[PDB]
Amino acid sequence: DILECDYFDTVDISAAQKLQNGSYLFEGLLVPAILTGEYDFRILPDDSKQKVARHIRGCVCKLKPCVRFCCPHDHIMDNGVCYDNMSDEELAELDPFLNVTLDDGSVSRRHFKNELIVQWDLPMPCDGMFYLDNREEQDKYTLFENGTFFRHFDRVTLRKREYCLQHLTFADGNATSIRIAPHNCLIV
Ligand SMILES: *[C@@H]1O[C@H](CO)[C@@H](O[C@@H]2O[C@H](CO)[C@@H](O)[C@H](O)[C@H]2NC(C)=O)[C@H](O)[C@H]1NC(C)=O
Ligand SMILES: *[C@@H]1O[C@H](CO)[C@@H](O)[C@H](O)[C@H]1NC(C)=O
Ligand SMILES: *[C@@H]1O[C@H](CO)[C@@H](O)[C@H](O)[C@H]1NC(C)=O
Ligand SMILES: [Pb+2]
Ligand SMILES: [Pb+2]
Numbered sequence: 001d002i003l004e005c006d007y008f009d010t011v012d013i014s015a016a017q018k019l020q021n022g023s024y025l026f027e028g029l030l031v032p033a034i035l036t037g038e039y040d041f042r043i044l045p046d047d048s049k050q051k052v053a054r055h056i057r058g059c060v061c062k063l064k065p066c067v068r069f070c071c072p073h074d075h076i077m078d079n080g081v082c083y084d085n086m087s088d089e090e091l092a093e094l095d096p097f098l099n100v101t102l103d104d105g106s107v108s109r110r111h112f113k114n115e116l117i118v119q120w121d122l123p124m125p126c127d128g129m130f131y132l133d134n135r136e137e138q139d140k141y142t143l144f145e146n147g148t149f150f151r152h153f154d155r156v157t158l159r160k161r162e163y164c165l166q167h168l169t170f171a172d173g174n175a176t177s178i179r180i181a182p183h184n185c186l187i188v
């Protein structure tokens with residue numbers, strides 16, 4: 001609906017402050033009216049449309065970089081399910097940084113929540129996703145600032161409809177740590 005904006009580059013802005021000149025103030029970001037629009041549908045895993053309450057969405061990813069998350073910013077992915085159970089301790093010890101490859105080909109460390117706009121209301125890419133642990137040689141990947149995801153093993157490029165990132169608990173030998181990991185669909 002929003003001119004020249006893929007649905008997966010949008011965020012729900014119904015809670016944003018609607019200004020006088022018609023533009024919006026979304027979490028400190030000025031969103032021009034042209035980048036906004038009403039939606040009465042939300043794409044689903046199968047790329048079909050479903051109905052939802054007439055709400056206003058904004059194409060914020062064209063204004064500030066976005067991170068394609070699987071769930072709300074403070075949830076953890078537990079074996080493919082969004083789980084809101086992070087203790088204050090985990091929230092403090094978790095690694096909030098993502099390595100994003102920029103257009104000049106360089107790598108930049110970015111805080112997932114403060115330096116990027118977390119998209120969490122998008123449909124789950126599929127049921128039973130597997131996750132990549134880039135500490136293993138076959139699990140390496142590249143995450144571009146523009147949203148493109150590249151899986152090294154089979155050199156396939158995934159768009160925002162096919163992957164999502166989320167905090168996840170990894171085993172540290174005989175300990176445990178939380179880091180953000182990408183989730184892909186095995187057969188989809
Ligand atoms: C997002 O960035 C990626 C990587 O910078 C773009 O995809 C690359 O496009 C070049 C163009 O010649 C290809 O040679 C590369 O092989 C592509 N890399 C991958 C991993 O696909 C992508 O086009 C950008 N998306 C947008 C909308 O600009
Ligand atoms: C709306 O007002 C803000 C400041 O209050 C201004 O920065 C912005 O450019 C205005 N919107 C447009 C479309 O000019
Ligand atoms: C980003 O790169 C650092 C340094 O190589 C690495 O230790 C860290 O695991 C990476 N971050 C994520 C979320 O994979
Ligand atoms: Pb826990
Ligand atoms: Pb693996």
